Symmetry: D4
């Protein structure tokens, strides 16, 4: 099946972080693709990727970048699709630069920003976006949430033990 | 006017309204029916939960939630709905909304919030519109038209600024 | 029989929050510990907070990191004093945790301690319990005097160390 | 007859700290207010802290700004719980005040509230006093219920406003 | 100081015309050294196509430096730099919140491969002066004008000091 | 790539030799474009006289750009800029605490009159590339080498993408 | 009498802040001079001022600067005298740049840093430096401190009134 | 060795010693007698006050005080002595000493603290030496000699680095 969500990043070195987005999508059986696309080193490829996304059938793009992180914003500039930006923390500043570079978009072009390093949540957010008007998928999200609660109960059990 | 809402624009206090009104305005620009509410995570946790839990059944497809300071509303609403929640950090008297921003965006693994810029309620509205357009070719074409109009305005401002600079030089 | 609840969003918070349990135990204050997530178990979180007073709790110590909403949401749902411990996560050194907990708008307070300061959250709960209780307040003073005595000893030791260094 | 002390380093702190006095008065908790400077009157500060318990105080709320040492130094000298209010000064928006108050090392806790959050410091003191006192705890719950009722009213009002707007 | 109708040697661009009150200082500095400049609104976020076209076309037109101002998530200087061999000077424009700290970090923190010369928050005047220094690097005559400019800055301080003695 | 014994066109300087592991990347970038460079330890804090002498003597010697790295209260780039007409590129070197935020602010926030071109924290490589861009601004042949460099950066990304498909 | 403390700043626009240092010195009858000396715009003058200070009889230099505030550090680099740096807050960042630019001196060259805008305290610190081995002046500082305490008692009186 | 101290090097906890030892070392380089103490503002406020109040009478001329986190020791010592107090912000487990720095340097009007860099105990020692030298021509000449030696070392490192770079080029 053709991908419905794209997961892109400026470097394969971002994969240790961005892999969680792919994992989250796979948990919900959403067809997805992953790409290295750099705003600064392949601007033409980036522009084409964004412009072509909707026509290819993509519904959401998750983009990760660090430092002066421009990839999410520039992709959002070039597509009508919702874009989720994942701030990737680099060697200095703990992703604070990445975060401000992504989230602080001036009026006109929005980027949905998640936590620093929060690729897993970007995946879950994409799923919620796909679920908004899809009752079947939405029910799957609700089930996922119920199961999350069960995990906490297991952790609480572990804590009782540790506190003994 | 008396339509069923597809998007909820909510906020922790009515003093957030001057900022959050921009989300409502953006939604109206795209003819998306929306409701505006005061829903307090801190002062009305039970009602906050009821709002979130009841949202999807009522036909809401996106919730835009604004709060400032220790801003918990977007996150706690997201915890109680499968719907996508957009969080608007509202800047308060101190810290220029840096506290609002971190308290909204830094959600640990499990529950996501789509966070926009500090004070960025308008962009929250536009983002909800993109979410609604993602699998709706007609609305999506409206979004592209909106984008092209923004671009045309920049070109007009570019020409105007060149003329202004040319005048100063002369 | 617990008088203080020590709760946290994840068992991964325990390396920090254990210090709160330790402090309470040093003053023989009965306590319970729980993993309770505001984000992943909001219903359980709400029930915990709502039921706390009925269950005989007098103080709740809550730890969380990142966008840390647990202390504030618990405080929203109980009349009891809630102490919030900002737990530092992988990035930002708990600055996000701190601001998320301390910056509560008017109406719902959270007593916030230092980043990672679970031990002090325990000591703070003890002070809250001791404010009116004569025996416990005397124990607190004795504890404070003991802290002063260790400082006197460490000071003397440091002086001897530096002395050995020069000689 | 005071049960809570509300102190601050300068009378210039009053525009903020007044909110603490107001909150206490709303719950009919007898309180005293004082200008007590850790830096300019360390002797008076020490005497205030040392004598607090003997004088019948149960909680001290202390506000200071910049390099804000008053809450911590008072807490160092009393077994009572101390609530610290970071007062924002001309630069840094109280971030310096906040870190100076909240980041107490292990041994001496300070319950820290939001920057400028004197009102919440008052509410927090009330919760500490109410934890065990049945009448006061019921007053707190009634207060919380009243807060929820104002939200319901403001929500309805906002909806009517937006309605008028569209129409 | 620069006469009208010269071909530009420096581009002064910004994401929005609301940036002009700030960016005008860059144009003023260039004019003081008689450097022909053009002023443009070029938006990375609202006109990505036009932004790339501007960047790629700059050097061929004889531009030698681009000064770019933007605020918030400030992507213009970086994206322009990605599409031109010319040195790009980024001016962080402070917006309503954060005092241009977001603008600064989003401009200066370019990862390896594409540099941007970043100046102080709101420092458009200094961006202009820096552009002049770039042009002067291999131009002895211009470089001598810069030295004189620096020398005369010292004379101004003498007058300020005189003013201070009076105030004291 | 640059042969030994050429007169330098760019100065790569730093406050301490402990900065070299970072600053070496600037020298490497210059060497890749065959730009002759000298490398120096010049301390604003420990050798103010020598620092001024270096700055004032640079242009006369044929230096066209100075790249200066410093950390903490990083004064070297600014003080050098105050004493030369040449463009100065400041590299914030991150020290043991604060992750080079102090270094960044102390370099970039120059008040009006004396600009410093600031690059990312630890971004010496980019400082070298920026210097090359400055030299290329009016040098069509060098400028064409920069464009090719940019073009080839894209090919590397293609290989990284291939690696990512394998990992996925 | 020849000045014992110099109070310098990069611009006369710093005077609204730095005036407090001069006031503090005058309260203790310490001969002082004030100068506009810019590290960035008059580096030669700055270097001469610092180098010549001790010979002229100066014992302490108070220097104020904002932004990339280099004046205190560069003066300290050029004199053996203790230098007190006053971070002057500019239009953006509330003097956080000024503070880090002054206080974060690497090993070898110290600058005594006071609060952002804290020129008054710089004056008081200079006085304490002069008092360290001058019992008469030190007694004057003690008296000053006693009087400070009296001011607080007056403020406390005012508060009792306001709280009524 | 068994001299009366002229400078006190104090700290809130003995875990600060690894940092503060640099102040003692700098003082020794200039043959300035110094004592090293643990003096806790938070755990021993009475003893802290006694130390500060007794300092000048005992012959101390400068106090160097280090503390981390909510660092109150330098300020509270300064409150209780007419002597100049140098504060060293000691970085703790979180925040890289930014908390230590702000809690020391941001003293409001009335009580000054001479603040040095985060972890900068060595510079604290050197600063105390400058204070002692300000009106002491012999010690001041020693300081100038120290400064010249630092400068000579930089020149040697400069030559060495040029040779290293020359080698790499070759």
């Amino acid at each position: 099946e053709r991908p419905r969500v794209g997961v892109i990043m400026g470097s394969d070195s971002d994969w240790p972080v961005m892999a969680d987005a792919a994992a989250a999508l796979a948990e919900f059986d959403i067809p997805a693709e992953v790409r290295v696309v750099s705003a600064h080193r392949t601007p033409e490829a980036m522009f084409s990727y964004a412009r072509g996304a909707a026509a290819r059938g993509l519904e959401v793009i998750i983009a990760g970048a660090g430092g002066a992180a421009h990839l999410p914003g520039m992709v959002a500039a070039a597509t009508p699709l919702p874009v989720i930006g994942v701030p990737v923390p680099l060697g200095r500043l703990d992703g604070l630069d990445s975060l401000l570079s992504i989230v602080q978009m001036p009026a006109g072009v929005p980027v949905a920003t998640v936590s620093i390093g929060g690729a897993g949540n970007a995946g879950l957010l994409a799923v919620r976006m796909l679920g908004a008007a899809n009752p079947q998928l939405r029910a799957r999200i609700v089930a996922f949430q119920d199961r999350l609660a069960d995990v906490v109960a297991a952790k609480d059990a572990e804590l009782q033990r540790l506190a003994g």
